[PDB]
Every structure is written in structure tokens, then in C-alpha cells.
Amino acid sequence: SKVGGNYNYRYRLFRKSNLKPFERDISTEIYNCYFPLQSYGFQPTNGVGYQPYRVVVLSFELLHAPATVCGPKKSTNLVKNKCVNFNFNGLTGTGVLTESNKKFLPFQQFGRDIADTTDAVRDPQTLEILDITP
Amino acid sequence: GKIQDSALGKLQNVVNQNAQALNTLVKQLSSNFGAISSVLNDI
Amino acid sequence: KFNGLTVLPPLLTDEMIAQYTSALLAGTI
Amino acid sequence: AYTNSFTRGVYYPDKVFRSSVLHSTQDLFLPFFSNVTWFHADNPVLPFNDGVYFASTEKSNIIRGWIFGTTLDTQSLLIVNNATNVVIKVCEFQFNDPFLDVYESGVYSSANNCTFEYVSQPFLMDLNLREFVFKNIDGYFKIYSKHTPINLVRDLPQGFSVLEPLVDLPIGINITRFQTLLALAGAAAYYVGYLQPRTFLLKYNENGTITDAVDCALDPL
Ligand SMILES: *[C@@H]1O[C@H](CO)[C@@H](O[C@@H]2O[C@H](CO)[C@@H](O)[C@H](O)[C@H]2NC(C)=O)[C@H](O)[C@H]1NC(C)=O
Ligand SMILES: *[C@@H]1O[C@H](CO)[C@@H](O[C@@H]2O[C@H](CO)[C@@H](O)[C@H](O)[C@H]2NC(C)=O)[C@H](O)[C@H]1NC(C)=O
Ligand SMILES: *[C@@H]1O[C@H](CO)[C@@H](O)[C@H](O)[C@H]1NC(C)=O
Ligand SMILES: *[C@@H]1O[C@H](CO)[C@@H](O)[C@H](O)[C@H]1NC(C)=O
Numbered sequence: 001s002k003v004g005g006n007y008n009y010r011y012r013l014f015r016k017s018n019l020k021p022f023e024r025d026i027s028t029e030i031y032n033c034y035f036p037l038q039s040y041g042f043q044p045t046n047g048v049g050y051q052p053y054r055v056v057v058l059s060f061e062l063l064h065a066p067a068t069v070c071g072p073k074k075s076t077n078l079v080k081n082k083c084v085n086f087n088f089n090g091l092t093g094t095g096v097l098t099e100s101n102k103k104f105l106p107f108q109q110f111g112r113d114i115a116d117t118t119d120a121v122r123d124p125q126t127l128e129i130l131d132i133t134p
Numbered sequence: 135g136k137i138q139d140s141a142l143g144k145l146q147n148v149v150n151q152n153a154q155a156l157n158t159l160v161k162q163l164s165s166n167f168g169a170i171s172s173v174l175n176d177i
Numbered sequence: 178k179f180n181g182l183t184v185l186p187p188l189l190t191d192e193m194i195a196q197y198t199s200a201l202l203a204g205t206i
Numbered sequence: 207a208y209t210n211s212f213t214r215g216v217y218y219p220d221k222v223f224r225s226s227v228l229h230s231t232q233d234l235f236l237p238f239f240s241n242v243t244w245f246h247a248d249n250p251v252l253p254f255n256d257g258v259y260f261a262s263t264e265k266s267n268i269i270r271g272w273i274f275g276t277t278l279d280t281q282s283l284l285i286v287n288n289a290t291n292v293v294i295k296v297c298e299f300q301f302n303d304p305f306l307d308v309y310e311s312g313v314y315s316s317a318n319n320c321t322f323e324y325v326s327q328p329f330l331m332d333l334n335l336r337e338f339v340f341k342n343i344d345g346y347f348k349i350y351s352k353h354t355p356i357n358l359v360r361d362l363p364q365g366f367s368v369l370e371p372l373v374d375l376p377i378g379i380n381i382t383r384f385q386t387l388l389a390l391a392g393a394a395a396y397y398v399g400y401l402q403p404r405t406f407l408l409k410y411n412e413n414g415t416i417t418d419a420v421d422c423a424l425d426p427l
């Protein structure tokens with residue numbers, strides 16, 4: 001709302017058909033004839049409760065392609081042939097780990113059983129296929 | 135000597151139905167049942 | 178497989194059923 | 207023109223390994239025994255629809271790559287090749303003689319604000335069937351390929367190959383139109399077919415390679 005002129009912001013008031021999720025529409029064609037955008041008040045005071053709020057939404061993609069935005073937790077050393085609790089790139093589990101001959105195709109990162117439970121994981125920094133045996 | 139050339143389906147149905155029953159019980163672990171994941175470690 | 182299913186062995190082994198089946202044959206003949 | 211004889215167009219649907227397993231997936235596959243368009247000529251402009259199967263064969267190499275866009279201008283993915291690298295851009299240009307043939311880049315490809323690049327070594331580079339699959343999704347453009355060796359000149363070879371992934375660039379474009387780029391009386395084979403959200407059953411062998419597929423909706427068997 002600052003008097004330096006920050007109150008340029010505006011919203012689409014009229015639209016032909018509902019906007020899809022994560023879709024965008026920049027058009028300003030005339031909507032009997034009306035401009036399709038309308039600007040908020042946002043003077044040093046708007047109406048009460050109509051102050052400008054800044055917003056950001058974080059969308060977490062979870063595609064199971066190689067992960068690229070990780071939390072600050074540092075890795076441990078890696079144990080084989082003992083049953084161990086583990087967290088690989090966010091895949092929490094529990095089992096006995098073993099460097100495994102059932103080699104993935106080079107693009108693949110997890111293996112799954114008949115059930116969705118994962119039977120193998122590619123270790124994200126030694127790059128070996130661990131068998132997980134429950 | 136003719137028994138070598140000759141009902142086993144009525145017995146194999148036991149082996150096949152127990153196999154299919156267990157396999158179906160395992161496959162239902164992949165089912166979400168409305169949850170955001172089929173694997174509890176995800177939740 | 179690992180998901181809590183387990184198949185238990187029968188009490189009578191296949192060899193024990195063969196022994197009984199042999200005993201029924203031997204007796205019969 | 208059209209051609210039909212293919213059990214081709216299967217690809218690995220998941221980034222996850224499966225072995226000695228028959229698995230059922232719904233994904234945008236090429237329906238079995240459909241009609242691919244066939245051309246071997248110009249740089250024609252075509253619909254992308256839900257996705258594309260593409261393949262080529264030629265003497266030496268003459269496919270240079272591809273153009274895509276929300277419109278034939280809007281952010282418009284370019285993928286073109288060096289001798290040793292593919293190089294990739296997201297910008298708008300005023301695609302209007304939109305070819306890379308004679309009138310390592312050109313075609314008024316003046317980028318200003320929109321490059322969002324990629325560049326890498328695995329692509330169509332000197333090796334005969336240059337199989338590709340392209341699949342735009344929300345935030346996604348995962349591209350697939352297989353350089354299947356063949357003896358045929360320009361008729362579509364019957365047989366089975368499964369395409370591996372090659373890259374994904376999160377372009378954010380909603381692509382609607384598509385075109386190829388050749389280089390230059392010359393001629394070379396290429397084929398195009400639109401993907402559909404079919405259900406397939408896939409036969410992963412012990413190696414975890416897809417050895418067979420059955421297009422579930424093809425026929426009653
Ligand atoms: C962003 O970059 C594109 C080019 O990638 C610019 O496109 C030009 O747009 C003007 C109209 O504004 C046209 O007359 C030109 O023909 C376009 N050039 C090309 C090569 O397509 C666009 O103007 C740029 N926008 C901003 C805000 O920088
Ligand atoms: C994965 O596929 C390859 C290729 O078919 C198999 O490798 C062959 O295995 C046999 C038996 O060990 C050898 O005689 C061949 O020489 C191997 N070929 C090559 C090119 O190395 C491999 O066995 C398969 N993996 C599994 C787990 O079955
Ligand atoms: C989809 O395409 C239309 C033009 O065909 C465009 O106006 C719209 O912004 C596009 N959507 C996205 C998310 O880019
Ligand atoms: C980075 O990854 C490599 C494997 O490519 C690994 O050997 C190395 O230890 C990792 N870096 C550090 C600092 O550990």
C-alpha cells in the first residue's frame with residue numbers, strides 16, 4: 001500500500017470459463033463492453049480487512065524422479081547385512097540391506113514388490129542397488 | 135498302462151484358488167482405500 | 178511374500194503319505 | 207499417407223524397477239496397429255495432441271530435431287543437435303519459413319527472456335531406426351528414445367522395441383502444434399503417431415526389461 005506507488009496490483013474480474021489448476025491467463029480482451037481486470041484499492045488504508053496480503057504457495061512435486069530439494073539432514077555411513085532402520089531420499093523403511101545383482105536400468109531409482117512396498121533402492125551417493133529384505 | 139494316458143482339473147482348482155486368494159490378498163496392499171498413499175511409511 | 182503371509186508345512190510329509198498308500202496297497206493285494 | 211504394421215511404441219512407464227512380473231498400467235501409449243503418418247518430405251507442421259511417437263531412418267544423418275509450441279510462435283520448445291550434444295531452448299520466436307535447411311543455429315531464433323536451457327550428450331547422434339516418444343504433461347515434457355538398428359530403407363519395420371527415458375525438462379508449456387527440422391533433392395524417412403491414454407499389460411522379465419505388451423483395448427482376446 002506504500003505511497004511510493006506500490007498499489008499497481010489487480011485481479012481478473014471476468015473470465016469466459018473456469019481456470020484449470022495451476023493454469024494462467026494474461027489476456028486483456030474486452031468482456032455491454034467491460035475491461036476484464038479490476039484493481040484492488042490498496043491505498044495506505046483500504047477498507048478494513050481488504051489490506052494487501054502477500055502469498056506464496058509451495059507445491060511439492062513428488063514425482064519419484066531423482067530428488068532435487070532435500071531437507072538439511074546430513075547422511076550417515078551405510079550398513080550391509082544387518083537389519084537397519086533407514087531413510088533414502090525420504091523413503092523411510094526398515095529391513096536388511098545388501099548390495100544386489102538385480103541391476104536396475106540406469107534411469108531407475110526404486111524397485112517395487114508385488115505389493116507397492118519397495119524391494120530395492122539405489123543409494124543416492126554410493127550409487128549401488130541395495131536389496132531391501134524385510 | 136492306460137492310466138499314463140489319463141480329472142486333475144478338479145484338484146488343480148484347489149491349488150489355483152489358494153494361489154489366487156493369496157495373490158489377491160497381497161495385491162490389495164497396493165490399494166489406497168481413499169488414503170493419500172498405499173504405503174504406510176509414506177503417511 | 179514378506180507381508181505377513183506364511184504357508185505352514187503339512188504334518189504328514191509326502192513320504193509318510195507314500196508309506197501309508199504303500200501299506201494300503203500291500204494290505205489290499 | 208499412412209502405415210499400420212506396428213507393435214511398436216511401448217516405453218517404460220515408471221522410473222521404478224519391476225522383475226519377472228506382469229504389470230498393468232494406464233498411460234499415453236501408441237495404440238497397437240493404429241495408423242502412423244508417413245512423409246519423407248519440406249518441414250510439415252502437425253498437431254501434438256496428447257503426445258507423439260516419432261521415428262526416422264536415413265543415409266548418414268539428416269534429422270536435426272524438432273519444434274513445439276502453444277502456438278506457431280508463446281514459449282516454443284526447440285531441441286536441435288550438434289555432432290556431440292543436443293541443445294534445447296524454451297523461447298518464443300515468430301515461427302514464416304520455419305526451417306533450419308539452407309535459406310549451428312538460425313531460423314530467427316532470437317531469444318531475449320525465456321531460454322530455460324538444457325544441453326547433453328544422449329540424443330540423435332551419429333550411430334538406424336531413430337525411435338522417439340514425446341509426452342507433455344503439467345510441468346513436464348519427458349522424452350524417450352531407442353536407436354533400434356534396422357536394414358529397411360523407408361517402410362516401417364514390424365517388431366518390438368521399448369523406449370527408455372532420455373530427459374525431462376519442466377517447460378511449463380501447453381504444447382499444441384509440432385514440427386520437425388531436417389538439414390539440406392534430398393529425402394529421408396520419418397513417421398508420426400498420436401498417443402492415447404490406453405491401458406497396457408507389460409511383461410517384465412527377470413532382467414526387468416519389458417519383453418511384451420498387450421494393448422488391453424485392442425481386441426477381445
Ligand atoms: C521476450 O522475448 C521474446 C522473444 O523470445 C520477445 O518477442 C518479441 O515480441 C515482439 C512484440 O512484443 C515482437 O514484435 C517480436 O517479433 C518478438 N520477437 C521474436 C523473436 O519472437 C518478447 O517481446 C520479449 N518480451 C519481453 C517483455 O522482454
Ligand atoms: C540380463 O540379460 C543379460 C543378457 O541376456 C544376461 O547376460 C547373459 O547371461 C548368461 C548367463 O550368465 C551369459 O552366458 C551371457 O554371456 C550373458 N550375456 C552378456 C552380454 O553378458 C543376464 O544373465 C541377465 N540377468 C539376469 C539376472 O537374468
Ligand atoms: C494454454 O494455451 C492457451 C493458448 O492456447 C494460453 O492462453 C494458456 O495460458 C496456456 N496455459 C498455460 C498454463 O500456459
Ligand atoms: C558425491 O557423490 C559421489 C558419488 O558420485 C561420492 O563418492 C562422494 O562422496 C559425494 N561427495 C561427498 C562430499 O561425500
Ligand SMILES: *[C@@H]1O[C@H](CO)[C@@H](O)[C@H](O)[C@H]1NC(C)=O
Pocket residue numbers: 208210239240241
Ligand atoms: C488406416 O488408414 C486407412 C486409409 O489409408 C483406413 O482405411 C484404415 O481404416 C485406417 N485404420 C486402420 C487400423 O487401418
Ligand SMILES: *[C@@H]1O[C@H](CO)[C@@H](O)[C@H](O)[C@H]1NC(C)=O
Pocket residue numbers: 287288289290293310311
Ligand atoms: C552446438 O551448437 C551451438 C548453436 O546451436 C553452437 O554455438 C556450439 O558451438 C555448437 N557446439 C559445437 C561443439 O560445435
